[PDB]
Amino acid sequence: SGFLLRLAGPMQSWGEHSMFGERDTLPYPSRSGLIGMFAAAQGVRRGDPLDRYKELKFTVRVDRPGVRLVDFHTIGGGLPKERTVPTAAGERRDPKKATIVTSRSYLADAVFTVAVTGPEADTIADALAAPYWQPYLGRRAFVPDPLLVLRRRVADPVRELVEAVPLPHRRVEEDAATVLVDLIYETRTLTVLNDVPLSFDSKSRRYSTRQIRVVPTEVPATLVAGPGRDYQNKLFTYVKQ
Amino acid sequence: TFVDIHAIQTLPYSNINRDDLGSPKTVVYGGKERTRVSSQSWKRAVRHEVEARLGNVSVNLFGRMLAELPSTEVDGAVQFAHAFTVHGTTVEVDFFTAVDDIPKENDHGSGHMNAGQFSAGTFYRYANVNLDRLVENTGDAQTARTAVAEFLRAFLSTVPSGKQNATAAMTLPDLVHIAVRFDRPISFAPAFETALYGSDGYTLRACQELNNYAERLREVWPDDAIRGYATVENKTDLAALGERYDSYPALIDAMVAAAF
Amino acid sequence: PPSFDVTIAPWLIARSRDVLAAPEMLGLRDVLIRSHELSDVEIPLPPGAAVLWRILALITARITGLDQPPNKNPKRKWQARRSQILSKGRLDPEAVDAYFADYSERFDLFHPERPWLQDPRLREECPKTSGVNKLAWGRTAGENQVWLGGHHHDLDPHPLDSAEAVWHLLATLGYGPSGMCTARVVRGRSERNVTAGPLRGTVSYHPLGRTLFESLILNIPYPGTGAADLAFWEQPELNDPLGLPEESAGLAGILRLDHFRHAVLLHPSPDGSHVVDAWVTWAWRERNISPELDPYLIYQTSKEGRVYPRPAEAERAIWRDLDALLHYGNYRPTILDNCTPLAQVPQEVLDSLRLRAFGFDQDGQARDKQWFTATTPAVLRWLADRETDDNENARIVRRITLARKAAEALGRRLEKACKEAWKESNSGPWVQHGMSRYWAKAEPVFWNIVYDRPAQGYTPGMAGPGNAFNLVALAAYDEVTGPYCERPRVAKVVERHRSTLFS
């Protein structure tokens, strides 16, 4: 069982621990987000039991860490006072203060290839191919790369993360081999953060911590693609086989 | 059933969106920085335009009213990608000075010196419409049908209002391609993961590059997707995008016809 | 009647030494008793945990700290008893029940009189309930807009779970907004104004270990010899709003637990499952200087000589867990500087202790921006033991300490660079993006310097950071000031201040 999910695209955000106007992303995908991505693909209404998703495992290798950028993002500004965001008391604030100013962060030009291994993950892959709601990378405005699922069915996909999945253009030294790539596994634990989603109900979303261990591993330098456009070519060669 | 629409609309010297400072918004994508027009800004103009022409489908096509309290449907189903330039773009500073009309025994002590940033380029826009949930939530397939058609026309016709009086950036897209897909929505954004080089323009080259990406994706995954595109150029054929149409509203009509 | 007990009811999430699967929620008494069994107890709200570790340091700790180092080289003998209980490795449950026994009937927060960290009289004199939404964090208040964290319109608000209510009450007693809460009259006195919380907008630093008991022991500031002290819940009778907040040389006055600037009362649900209404209001009109600096926070002196805690910065939270690297270090918190070093007394314990910090970056007023927890990575010390040698190890540790020093020195150099340049160029917003870009680019180069992987500006095996950090700062600074170095007048200013980052 298992399939390869490729998270790529111009921008993707995987925030955790932010609860005000400023938003912040983890430099790598968060299990909560990917689980919600599958739940959205399967029609799981907000508030439905998320234990079906329990028992999955997410090893994620970071091809390009990507640049982290902060996207300004106002809400309601430049509108007449009557048509701005409501207050909790119900009376709209004065128009010179009715604007909301959020500073949301997002990863741009970053690409990870998570190898999801679970009990029903093959039905989940078959659900991403025909989604109930549009899958997106973190914020809904970010739209996933068309090669969202590199392979629908793979026996031992981590074995395919160690090798035989192409890689972006990187420095390849003379007489070099085995270019270093950071794999992320789920003592030797990088960080602890609230990921595993106890409930997605918008009224009270709650989570619990998951330790992450990031192990730099060594994959053959043959894997990295040539400088220009070759990455797309090798990747497409990869999807048909 | 997912109706998605790609446009390659170019914009002259303008500053449609800007940061907390004056400079416009940029994605760093494909290793080359490129200006962008954020999704919410563009969405706001489209939603305002749809609600103005249409006279609660705006809470259905678009998820919820900003100034209304949540009515248990905050999701809009419609997905708006953030528009970004086909090529890499350097931010172009425009130094300006406001002139003082009353003259002292002094000349040119100008009223106000400053410098504002602008940029121009060919943005590759893209959107999605979750048709089935829109029908299940709206109820009547007809209101949904009119709403979907008018939403596509709004996506095409409009341009954001930002520094528009100083730069008349009003423009029509060069290419639109509406693909009624049943498998899943897909954006042709990776066609431009390698920013195109310059000095000969980008409209035509971006048109055939997006044609190459449509051939390849159509090749790996052959689908029952109904497609069609309309261009302001008759010089180049793009067979992978589907049957060509004489115009944009004729195209929108044929694809709205194709969804139902 | 509704009743809830911190000692018996389950609210504290608890993680065991083994398995590391299915953390169970337990009461305060149970955690206290089973401490060596559990690695740690966690609260989702870093403010809630920041006051929590303060109160837990006053219970288990108080019994172990003894509240009395008279004669006998006080610091030496407390460190002697400290070594004695640290050597036992556990606390006898009978001494806990005895402590609980003294005030056993006084804990159940929903008390008709004497509710937990609350004022029971408050209900009668305040006409408008603040509401749960005004108490709970991440929850929209009366004037707050409806955009985030679920939309609460303040009409039929969904009640907080009692356990949940406890976390919020504790946070607001720590961090709390200032100005214009709901006024309650006290014999003719009505002033909606309210002063801010004692630790508001600060990062609390709590050292951790391998098991709970260790941390609780190592978490108590050493109480200097002084007046015997007690907590807000150890107070024999209510304070009254008027009058002076009396000083307290005891550690309860150094845990900032003698009295709160904020006064909360939570109206219970009939079953006791939830809170329905809440009253947040002042308990004191006259502010008092709290004696002695708080061990946990990092302090700073500024021209005029005034001493204030260094505010949390959400930009340092961009690089996950940077503050917990505090241990590898000028100015240092006193609790860490008493318990972590080698003058103390434990033998090996110090080798496996690891630091954790709770920071809530916010305005000192009512605006709030970001909170974050931060335990040190276990990989940095474990990478030191993979080898097991005296030299490549001391060199790893030296490298890591060195890397951290370079990243921070140029972090302040770059803050002051952007700040000075922005002010000068217009005769700041450059600082925000400067720091954001800085830590985002400075994060992987650090991890490349530790592994000795090759990072630009660094050569593997170099004795120190090697200018690796000075390069990232210059690239972030030049990334930010980039579009404005066009005019020659502004370019001259920007150049004068980038030159300082050259080192």
**Which one of C142, C158, C378 has the shortest CB-CB distance to A89?**
C142
For A128, other C-beta atoms within 10 Å of its C-beta total 20
Contact of B168 with chain C, judged by CB distance below 8 Å, is answered with: no
**Which one of A65, A88, A214 has the shortest CB-CB distance to C152?**
A88
Report the residue of C39, C148, C325 to disrupt the A interface, i.e. the one with the largest count of A CBs within 10 Å.
C148
Report how far residue B87's alpha carbon sits from residue B119's, in angstroms, rounded to the nearest whole number: 12
φ, ψ of residue C368 to 5 degrees: the values are -140, 145
Are B130 and A232 inside 8 Å of each other by CB? no
* Final resolution, Å: 3.3
CA C421 to chain centre: 32
Are A88 and C142 inside 8 Å of each other by CB? yes
Q: C258: which DSSP letter?
A: S
Report the residue of C145, C369, C372 to disrupt the A interface, i.e. the one with the largest count of A CBs within 10 Å.
C145
Report how far residue C232's alpha carbon sits from residue C478's, in angstroms, rounded to the nearest whole number: 52
Start-end of H helices in C362-428: 378-387, 391-426
Paired with B125 in beta bridges are B7
- Residues after which chain B is broken (C–N above 2.5 A) are 55
Query: Which of C289, C281, C239 lies closest to C259, judged by CA?
Result: C239
C-chain CB neighbours of A184 within 8 Å are none
> How far, CA to CA in Å, does B50 sit from each of B1, B46, B53, B210, B222?
21, 6, 5, 28, 34
Q: A90 in helix, strand or coil?
A: coil
Query: Which of B170, B13, B9 lies closest to B85, judged by CA?
Result: B9
Write the single-letter amino acid at C67: D
Q: C195: which DSSP letter?
A: P
C-chain CB neighbours of A214 within 8 Å are 379
Report how far residue B258's alpha carbon sits from residue B2's, in angstroms, rounded to the nearest whole number: 11
Are C487 and B115 inside 8 Å of each other by CB? yes
Report how far residue C63's alpha carbon sits from residue B56's, in angstroms, rounded to the nearest whole number: 64
Q: Find, in chain C, the residue whose alpha carbon is nearest to that of A194.
A: C44
**Which one of B69, B79, B194 has the shortest CB-CB distance to A143?**
B79
CA C207 to chain centre: 11
Report how far residue C227's alpha carbon sits from residue C51's, in angstroms, rounded to the nearest whole number: 23
How do the domains of chain B map onto residue ranges? 1-260
Report the residue of B32, B82, B181, B196 to disrupt the A interface, i.e. the one with the largest count of A CBs within 10 Å.
B82
Start-end of H helices in A62-205: 121-128, 157-162
Query: Could you give the strand order of the β-sheet that contains C24-26, starting from the edge strand earlier in sequence?
Result: C24-26, C12-16, C38-42
Instruction: Determine contact, residues C236/C294, Cβ cutoff 8 Å.
Output: no
Q: C229 in helix, strand or coil?
A: coil
Query: Which of C376, C8, C14 lies closest to C211, judged by CA?
Result: C14
CA–CA min distance C152, chain B (Å): 9
CA C341 to chain centre: 21
* H or E segment and range at residue C303: none
**Which chains sit next to B, with 3 or more Cβ pairs under 8 A?**
A, C
Strands C368-375 and C354-362: antiparallel
CA–CA min distance C206, chain A (Å): 16
Are A208 and C23 inside 8 Å of each other by CB? yes
C-chain CB neighbours of A19 within 8 Å are 137-138, 148-149, 371
Instruction: Determine contact, residues C117/C170, Cβ cutoff 8 Å.
Output: yes
Report how far residue A80's alpha carbon sits from residue B184's, in angstroms, rounded to the nearest whole number: 39
In the A/B pair of chains, how many CB contacts fall below 8 A? 102
Largest CA distance in chain B: 77
CA B72 to chain centre: 28
B-chain CB neighbours of C494 within 8 Å are none
In the B/C pair of chains, how many CB contacts fall below 8 A? 16
Write the single-letter amino acid at A166: P
CA A187 to chain centre: 26
Strands A111-117 and C262-268: unpaired
> How far, CA to CA in Å, does C149 sit from each of A21, A44, B87, C308?
10, 20, 38, 32
Report how far residue C43's alpha carbon sits from residue B72's, in angstroms, rounded to the nearest whole number: 30
State the number of CA atoms in the 13 A half-sphere of C223 facing the CB. Answer: 28
Is A218 exposed, middle or buried (CB count within 10 Å of its CB: 0-12, 13-18, 19+)? exposed
**Tokens 């837990």 belong to residue:** C56
C-chain CB neighbours of A192 within 8 Å are 375
Report how far residue C428's alpha carbon sits from residue C415's, in angstroms, rounded to the nearest whole number: 10
CA–CA min distance A151, chain C (Å): 30
Are C486 and B70 inside 8 Å of each other by CB? no
Q: Find, in chain C, the residue whose alpha carbon is nearest to that of A103.
A: C369
Question: Could you say which residues from 200 to 219 on chain B have a Cβ atom under 8 Å away from some Cβ of chain C?
Answer: none
Torsion, Cα of B63, B64, B70, B73 (10° steps): -30
Can you read off the two tokens belonging to residue B251?
Answer: 């195209």
φ, ψ of residue C388 to 5 degrees: the values are 65, 45
A-chain CB neighbours of C138 within 8 Å are 19-20
Report the residue of A45, A63, A109 to disrupt the B interface, i.e. the one with the largest count of B CBs within 10 Å.
A109
Strands C38-42 and C12-16: antiparallel
Can you read off the two tokens belonging to residue A209?
Answer: 């911590």
**Tokens 């609860």 belong to residue:** A19
Report how far residue B29's alpha carbon sits from residue B17's, in angstroms, rounded to the nearest whole number: 18
CB-based burial, A10-43: b 16+ in 10 Å, e otherwise: bbbbbbbbbebbbbbbbbbbbbbbbbbbbbbbbe
A-chain CB neighbours of B67 within 8 Å are 76, 79, 82-86, 92
Are A128 and B184 inside 8 Å of each other by CB? yes
Contact of B63 with chain A, judged by CB distance below 8 Å, is answered with: no
Q: C172 in helix, strand or coil?
A: helix
Neighbouring residues of C155: CB distance < 8 A, sequence distance ≥ 6: none
Can you read off the two tokens belonging to residue C430?
Answer: 């450059």
Report how far residue C140's alpha carbon sits from residue C121's, in angstroms, rounded to the nearest whole number: 26
Instruction: Determine contact, residues A9/A106, Cβ cutoff 8 Å.
Output: no
Q: B8 in helix, strand or coil?
A: strand
Paired with B26 in beta bridges are B35
Query: Which of C25, C279, C274, C44 lies closest to C138, judged by CA?
Result: C44
Are B220 and A240 inside 8 Å of each other by CB? yes
Report how far residue A175's alpha carbon sits from residue A172's, in angstroms, rounded to the nearest whole number: 9
Contact of B249 with chain A, judged by CB distance below 8 Å, is answered with: no
Q: C328 in helix, strand or coil?
A: helix
Query: Which of A132, A32, A11 lies closest to B80, judged by CA?
Result: A11
Report how far residue C381's alpha carbon sits from residue C373's, in angstroms, rounded to the nearest whole number: 19
Backbone dihedral region of A123: left (phi > 0), alpha (psi from -120 to 50 degrees) or beta? Answer: alpha
Query: Which of B186, B180, B152, B158 lies closest to B171, judged by CA?
Result: B158
Question: Could you say which residues from 429 to 468 on chain C have a Cβ atom under 8 Å away from some Cβ of chain B?
Answer: 429
Q: B212 in helix, strand or coil?
A: helix
Contact of B224 with chain A, judged by CB distance below 8 Å, is answered with: no
DSSP class per residue in B136-156: HHH--HHHHHHHHHHHHHHHH
CA–CA min distance C154, chain B (Å): 11
Contact of C489 with chain B, judged by CB distance below 8 Å, is answered with: no
Instruction: Determine contact, residues A32/A187, Cβ cutoff 8 Å.
Output: no
For C193, other C-beta atoms within 10 Å of its C-beta total 11
Q: C225: which DSSP letter?
A: S
**Which one of C151, C483, C487 has the shortest CB-CB distance to B91?**
C483
CA–CA min distance B204, chain C (Å): 30
Can you read off the two tokens belonging to residue B188?
Answer: 């042709």
Q: Strand runs (DSSP E) across chain B, as ranges?
A: 2-14, 26-29, 32-37, 79-80, 83-85, 92-98, 112-130, 175-181, 228-231, 243-244
Report how far residue A40's alpha carbon sits from residue B113's, in angstroms, rounded to the nearest whole number: 52
C-chain CB neighbours of B70 within 8 Å are 146, 151
Q: At what angle do helices B141-157 and B248-259 cross, to 10 degrees?
A: 150
Is the sign of the CA dihedral C149, C151, C154, C156 positive or negative?
negative
Q: C269: which DSSP letter?
A: P
Q: Find, in chain B, the residue whose alpha carbon is nearest to that of A240.
A: B220
CA–CA min distance B142, chain A (Å): 22
